[PDB]
Paper text:
LCAD substrate specificity overlaps those of VLCAD and MCAD, and in addition includes unsaturated and branched-chain substrates. Here we present the three-dimensional structure of human LCAD, revealing an unusually large substrate-binding cavity not previously reported in eucaryotic ACADs.
Binding of acetoacetyl-CoA to Molecules C and D would result in steric clashes between the adenine ring of FAD in Mol C and loop residues located between Glu151 and His156 of symmetry related Mol A, and between the FAD adenine of Mol D and the loop comprised of Glu105-His106-Leu107 of symmetry related Mol B. As in the structures of other acyl-CoA dehydrogenases, the carbonyl oxygen of the fatty acyl-CoA moiety of the substrate makes hydrogen bonds to the 2’-hydroxyl of the FAD ribityl chain (2.8 Å) and to the peptide backbone of (Gly412-N, 2.6 Å). New hydrogen bonding interactions contributing to significant CoA binding affinity are observed upon ligand binding. In the wild type structure, the chain starts at Glu34 (monomer A) or Leu36 (monomers B, C, and D). The C-terminal residue Lys430 is observed in all the monomers in the 2.8 Å structure of the wild type protein complexed with acetoacetyl-CoA, but not in the 2.5 Å wild type ligand-free and 2.0 Å (E291Q mutant) structures.
Numbering used by the authors:
A (entry chain D), D (entry chain A): 33 to 430
B (entry chain C), C (entry chain B): 33 to 429
Write the structure that this text describes.
Amino acid sequence: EERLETPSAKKLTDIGIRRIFSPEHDIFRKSVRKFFQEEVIPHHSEWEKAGEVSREVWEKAGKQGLLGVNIAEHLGGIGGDLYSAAIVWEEQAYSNCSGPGFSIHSGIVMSYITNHGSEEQIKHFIPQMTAGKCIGAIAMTEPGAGSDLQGIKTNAKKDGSDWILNGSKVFISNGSLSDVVIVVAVTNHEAPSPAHGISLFLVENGMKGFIKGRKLHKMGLKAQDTAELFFEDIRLPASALLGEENKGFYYIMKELPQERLLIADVAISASEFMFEETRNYVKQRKAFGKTVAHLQTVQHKLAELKTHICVTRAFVDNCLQLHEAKRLDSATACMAKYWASELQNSVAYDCVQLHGGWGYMWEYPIAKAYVDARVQPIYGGTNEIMKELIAREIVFDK
Amino acid sequence: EERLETPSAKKLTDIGIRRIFSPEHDIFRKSVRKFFQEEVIPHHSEWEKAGEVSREVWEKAGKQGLLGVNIAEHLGGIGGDLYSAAIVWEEQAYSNCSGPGFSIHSGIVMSYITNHGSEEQIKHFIPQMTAGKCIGAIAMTEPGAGSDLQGIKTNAKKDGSDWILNGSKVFISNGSLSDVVIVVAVTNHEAPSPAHGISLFLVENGMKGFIKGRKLHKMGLKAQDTAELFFEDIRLPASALLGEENKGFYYIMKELPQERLLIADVAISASEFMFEETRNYVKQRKAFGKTVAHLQTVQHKLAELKTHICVTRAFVDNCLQLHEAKRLDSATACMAKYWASELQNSVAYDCVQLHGGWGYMWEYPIAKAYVDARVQPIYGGTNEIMKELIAREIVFD
Amino acid sequence: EERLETPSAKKLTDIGIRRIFSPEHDIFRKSVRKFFQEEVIPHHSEWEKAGEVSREVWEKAGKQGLLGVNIAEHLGGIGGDLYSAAIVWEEQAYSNCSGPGFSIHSGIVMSYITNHGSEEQIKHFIPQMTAGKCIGAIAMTEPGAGSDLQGIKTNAKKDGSDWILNGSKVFISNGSLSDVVIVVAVTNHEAPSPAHGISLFLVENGMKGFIKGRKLHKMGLKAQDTAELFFEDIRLPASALLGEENKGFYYIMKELPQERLLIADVAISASEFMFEETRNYVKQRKAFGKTVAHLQTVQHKLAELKTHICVTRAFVDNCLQLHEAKRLDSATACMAKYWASELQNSVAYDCVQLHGGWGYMWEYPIAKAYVDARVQPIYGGTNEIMKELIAREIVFD
Amino acid sequence: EERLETPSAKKLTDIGIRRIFSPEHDIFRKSVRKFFQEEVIPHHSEWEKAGEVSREVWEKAGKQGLLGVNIAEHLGGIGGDLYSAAIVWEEQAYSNCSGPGFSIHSGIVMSYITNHGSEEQIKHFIPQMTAGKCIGAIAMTEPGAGSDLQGIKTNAKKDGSDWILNGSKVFISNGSLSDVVIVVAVTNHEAPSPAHGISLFLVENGMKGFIKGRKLHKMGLKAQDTAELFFEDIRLPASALLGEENKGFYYIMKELPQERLLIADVAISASEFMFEETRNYVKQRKAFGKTVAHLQTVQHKLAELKTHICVTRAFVDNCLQLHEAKRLDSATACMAKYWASELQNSVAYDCVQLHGGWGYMWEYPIAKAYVDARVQPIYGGTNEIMKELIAREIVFDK
Ligand SMILES: CC(=O)CC(=O)SCCNC(=O)CCNC(=O)[C@H](O)C(C)(C)COP(=O)(O)OP(=O)(O)OC[C@H]1O[C@@H](n2cnc3c(N)ncnc32)[C@H](O)[C@@H]1OP(=O)(O)O
Ligand SMILES: CC(=O)CC(=O)SCCNC(=O)CCNC(=O)[C@H](O)C(C)(C)COP(=O)(O)OP(=O)(O)OC[C@H]1O[C@@H](n2cnc3c(N)ncnc32)[C@H](O)[C@@H]1OP(=O)(O)O
Ligand SMILES: Cc1cc2nc3c(=O)[nH]c(=O)nc-3n(C[C@H](O)[C@H](O)[C@H](O)COP(=O)(O)OP(=O)(O)OC[C@H]3O[C@@H](n4cnc5c(N)ncnc54)[C@H](O)[C@@H]3O)c2cc1C
Ligand SMILES: Cc1cc2nc3c(=O)[nH]c(=O)nc-3n(C[C@H](O)[C@H](O)[C@H](O)COP(=O)(O)OP(=O)(O)OC[C@H]3O[C@@H](n4cnc5c(N)ncnc54)[C@H](O)[C@@H]3O)c2cc1C
Ligand SMILES: Cc1cc2nc3c(=O)[nH]c(=O)nc-3n(C[C@H](O)[C@H](O)[C@H](O)COP(=O)(O)OP(=O)(O)OC[C@H]3O[C@@H](n4cnc5c(N)ncnc54)[C@H](O)[C@@H]3O)c2cc1C
Ligand SMILES: Cc1cc2nc3c(=O)[nH]c(=O)nc-3n(C[C@H](O)[C@H](O)[C@H](O)COP(=O)(O)OP(=O)(O)OC[C@H]3O[C@@H](n4cnc5c(N)ncnc54)[C@H](O)[C@@H]3O)c2cc1C
């Protein structure tokens, strides 16, 4: 059948558009949008004050079949393609709730394990993940080291068949409701190469030495339990280490593409959200004898935004298609992420200007999405880094 | 002697720079800065939680002589010039403490009373205000009528020498600590336009009928008590009238320039703080054996912000000199409010970025400047309005 | 089977990339790229000084079959899908020779006739237009009206089955070389709107009263013979009428999407060429020791550039596919022309800067590119008018 | 007394505004304006075709006191304050005639000579130059070295009390009409950094081995005779050396501030010209029944342009004031050159878009302007070099 293009639809969020989809995805959509209308938005204004969401919507989440959607079915996941697990990405954005740490779990942590883990490890965790009992997260950053992920200090020493973890990890998405945490740690301090001596681990909550810090007070993402994680001589087991020892950077390198494709879709989706939202506010808010939307200026400001969102959507869709065939390279990934997150902010700022005074009020969706979008250029690897990598191929014959 | 302009100064916020100031102005600014570092900066974290600052501080600022600076001294104010009052707006900006509403109080509310109010009204209010015992505020906006003042539904019917007040004003600053508020009320539903039937009233705290509503929840300005104000049949005595009846729109007119200059200067000043703050951060944050300030991309992103800040500041300081002389017209003040307020957010944004993760943390001074910055392009008249006005001398003849 | 996207390709101009082309298209693109390299590129400077290309290059283009790559084989064209016609648009842009007014001929005029004209007309023109012996041009814009098309004044009055054409057009492409010009004229001086009283006419070089004005001096498109046209009491035989009398404007709205889409792709292809040409320069230009491609700022700029270009490229290849399926509406068509033409200029500005002073010398491809680009946001309907339209579906019904 | 500022005047280009000028200055402005109105504008098209102005307009300029205005009266110049010199800069800009290379001549070359030249040099050149009978041109950029001024190859080696000059310089304004050219050349290859091994040389039209190359084809400055220069084993006497040996790079870094300040003023002045040409155009253009000036989008775009132009002018005049007092540093000057030249191209682009199809026809002032403006961000130090220097004092503490 003929699916319309985003620019031609009645709404950017309209279900049933964009050729990278099929009628089967249409139906899975109603469900995810419906699930949020009933299980997420109704309580988010309560989880924000809390500093995290309930563990109750996490089990409901898994029970519904939205966690681990693109994780193979013969491992403990629904076993769908990417074209549909991203619909879970997109839909959370179309609801404006940055509390639930779904994707950071479904699309990233559930992906490392099912991709670089061992028989024992897969079965131990993948079922819990899809279930909703085990909450995943990852800790790469350190208060003193960041984009330079080559200069961290956390480490796990060689003790018997055990690894002794020592360190701290600031800024961890879902660092309070965590059960399983993929911590990046140095195993070779004298490692002749920053890349050659970093290992991955799966530290589990309930261990001696693993303390969780208070929920970090941020300017946005008020409902995300970001917190500092500590490691006080945690005696890890032989099942602790993930992938080969001193080969962490290798497993990380093969995941980023996906991570950035995710962050990206969300950004643009979140943009399609604010657009239709802002479009509505002006199509009614009356002034100077009729509506603001009757003003030429606003009409042109609107054309500019819809055009920029549409154009970028085409790129993100195109990137999803590639990734389906596993032919989406690290660079093309960095483009989608970089453009989409920079776009999300630009759109947010303008969209708030359009509400005027009520865009600063926490009551309207847009104000929350403003401080919610200023985290995109900062995490997942700053957009300054995205340029470095993109530029790698341009300037050097590598 | 000779002074340096922001560009050549060791730091944009140094004391003793910018040619529109004198040695005396410098001495004063040093005082005001000290005040903020010790009587405001230390309590802000609490006020943010509080959702409002203390009357304690407002009154300390009274003895100090920061309230009513450019208000004549033979009228209850401390009677300095415009540069001196400007200094207090700038200094509050340099402390990154949005909580205190000092500016609106002496820059706006107190001007309205000393410029159009009555002799008896002056005696009763000015000194109380210069001391900070009577915190003043102003309420023009209404839920659906902000950038269109003619569409204000708050009205005052006549009843003897009394006026009955009814209506609802949203977004009012200091609507939790306000003792005297200037309300914009329609007094003549019968007139060629609200611009001919509006009056200003001095609604005091405690008049039966004046319900100070709940503090609104915003994304920034966490320590400035922003609230809704309700008026139910308030019995306003003759004395409440400020200026001539149905002349409110004319007085508002006369004051708007200064209101725009004030935001102009706060905005540029706010940008000045962020810049020197971010500059410092990149010089300390370590990356690759060296500092992130060694990067060429960063170096350039800084030259851009600084250049755009130094440039805008020049214009704004040129507008301060023009207002001193009472020669800053409506358009020019609009240009200042516009360019500076717009510039403020673009500076906020590029600045959070250079902070990386932390810029997001409410721990860093910047994150608070970011949310405290998204307000400038909106209040005091959206930039869209400034453009329409600026454009009147351009397009029409 | 598998094809890389511009991002992964070794160059955005590489033959054999982009999902919307069959291995058959590749082979074709190679002959066209060969055509411009060998038949256009070497003689362009000569045409630049002359202000118009040779008739030879046109005929050479008809023989190679580039004129009407998407006009029905049975009507007199060479047939082929839109993706093919596009290649000829794209390849020209890639040679950076805005001289040949090929696209307007093939993609527009040849299309107005095989879409609304009679068989006598179709038969009489289409064969020689593809052969490149008859150069066509479109002429609607006038001295006082372009955007607001219903504001024209060229009129056609009936005198028998004959037509008396009067008026003038300005900014007409392929103007001095045109043998055939589709003129837009008001036929019904009184109707609901000029939108319902407009007709089309095929004016032929030779008819008495058809005077070709002086060639125009422009900042760019130096080899594009842009001229002014004058119609002095022209008696057009009945066959001159193209389409149902007083329906023209409706015919025009139908073809606009094509025009916009065309511009869109020329625009982005130009940017593709430009980025590639600049990446080349920065890598072979040394300074302070290593090349200027090593400098971190030069990289990040290139990265931004490559991104915005690949992102736009996609949206355009999206509109090509859509137009192939006869499914490209006005708005979507508008988005492409607008976003792309502006991205075009922006890329040009940055690319010149990257060349340093050499980016100002006519000798380097980047300078013609800069001035040749400034026209896209203007013709084919101004970017403002593009928005006005894209905004209708957004705001109204 | 009460001089209006650019925002308040009836026009940005009106005479008698801006607080940095005296009533005397206005009289002088009227004089200089009439001169372009009558002596330059009327003949510019023909110089455009020719690729150079006439020696006669230079001479008419010299006899009427427009050359060497800020040059010492007693040394040969007319002896006016910086502001008068600037007035000439500005008026040439207001006329939209970038043909006459007067600014480089009076503003750059003549300053170099009277600043670091001997008494014999001053007497031998200044009076001719103020008389427009001796045209000046500076030449330091080369086919392989521009931004990297420390990378030039042009050199001179001593031979008795003579110097042997060899090399080539590109992009030399006034290169065609020049009678004297200050040539930057290396005089000491063994210096630690070539910054200490450079010297200035007064090459004179006619010296053996001094060849004027091909007059360059550009996208703009069609009437500015920019050319390529050659020096093949020239025997320079001792007098030829301007200033002291190896102290060349020093004399230059000391003059740059004036080069950039001048470019900054020309830039913003060009922006004022374009504003008013366009304002007046949109106001007299009919479309859809009303003038285009009436379209709200057009008023805001115009309001933006004006505010940004008035704001930069404010910075620039403040910079002229500082320079007159000799207290304008390298960094400030750079901020000015940078911001203004960028704004110029920005304004030119918008202004062309408002003229519509006419802004592309050379017949219209705005077209000369758009192309003529693209060079400002490149010469006198590329805007990127401008940032390099501005950042220097932001990131480095004494
Ligand atoms: C590469 C190149 O070099 C090519 C070139 O530059 S050649 C020159 C290109 N020129 C252009 O593109 C001209 C640009 N102008 C336009 O697109 C339009 O004039 C415009 C966008 C400015 C809008 O003009 P407008 O006056 O608002 O037209 P609009 O409002 O749509 O007119 C309404 C009418 O359209 C009519 N209409 C349009 N298409 C119709 C159709 N197919 N069937 C029936 N009616 C139709 C409606 O009936 C409607 O009737 P009314 O006037 O009674 O309401
Ligand atoms: C319209 C027109 O006509 C305008 C034109 O285009 S004319 C030509 C315009 N050309 C330009 O503007 C060239 C632009 N380039 C430059 O200005 C410089 O090359 C530059 C800004 C890029 C800096 O170059 P650089 O190689 O980094 O120089 P830099 O590193 O600062 O050199 C350091 C030295 O300067 C020396 N220095 C500078 N001025 C000095 C002085 N006057 N006395 C003593 N030392 C001085 C310092 O002692 C220092 O010594 P070290 O070698 O021990 O470090
Ligand atoms: C809400 C939120 C959730 C997050 N969740 C996680 C998580 O779950 N796990 C985790 O480990 N981290 C997470 N982070 C942390 C985040 O990924 C890091 O803060 C970010 O990737 C790097 O920030 P930094 O300050 O450490 O980088 P810094 O090194 O401090 O960089 C500071 C500035 O210098 C710039 N700079 C440094 N190097 C370069 C360069 N090479 N070129 C140009 N500029 C450069 C940076 O881009 C940035 O602009 C999260 C952050 C936030 C805000
Ligand atoms: C935190 C905060 C503090 C404030 N403090 C005060 C205060 O103390 N006292 C007070 O009275 N008010 C104050 N305000 C209110 C503020 O001044 C008003 O919100 C503002 O003046 C008008 O915005 P609005 O909410 O009325 O939106 P509206 O004016 O209804 O709509 C504005 C939106 O439509 C656009 N629009 C409107 N008109 C035009 C136009 N003509 N052309 C093009 N676009 C247009 C605007 O640019 C913007 O996009 C404050 C507001 C906030 C948020
Ligand atoms: C080199 C070149 C080749 C061209 N070839 C052809 C050709 O072959 N045949 C042909 O007929 N034309 C052609 N044109 C002309 C071109 O199509 C028109 O110039 C253009 O479509 C409209 O410009 P205009 O001259 O009508 O300017 P105007 O329509 O007068 O517009 C002037 C300014 O007002 C703006 N404006 C107008 N209306 C609005 C509005 N409603 N809202 C907001 N802003 C508005 C315009 O965008 C512009 O900023 C060509 C132009 C050039 C330069
Ligand atoms: C019309 C015209 C007239 C001129 N008149 C004169 C004259 O009369 N006399 C004279 O000698 N010169 C003159 N010039 C030359 C001009 O000053 C130089 O072209 C300019 O200063 C440097 O450009 P370039 O050609 O050296 O480019 P390059 O310096 O070779 O390369 C410049 C490109 O690389 C970038 N780049 C280089 N270094 C850095 C850096 N370190 N960091 C970041 N980016 C960098 C530049 O920003 C730009 O993108 C003129 C030039 C033109 C165009």
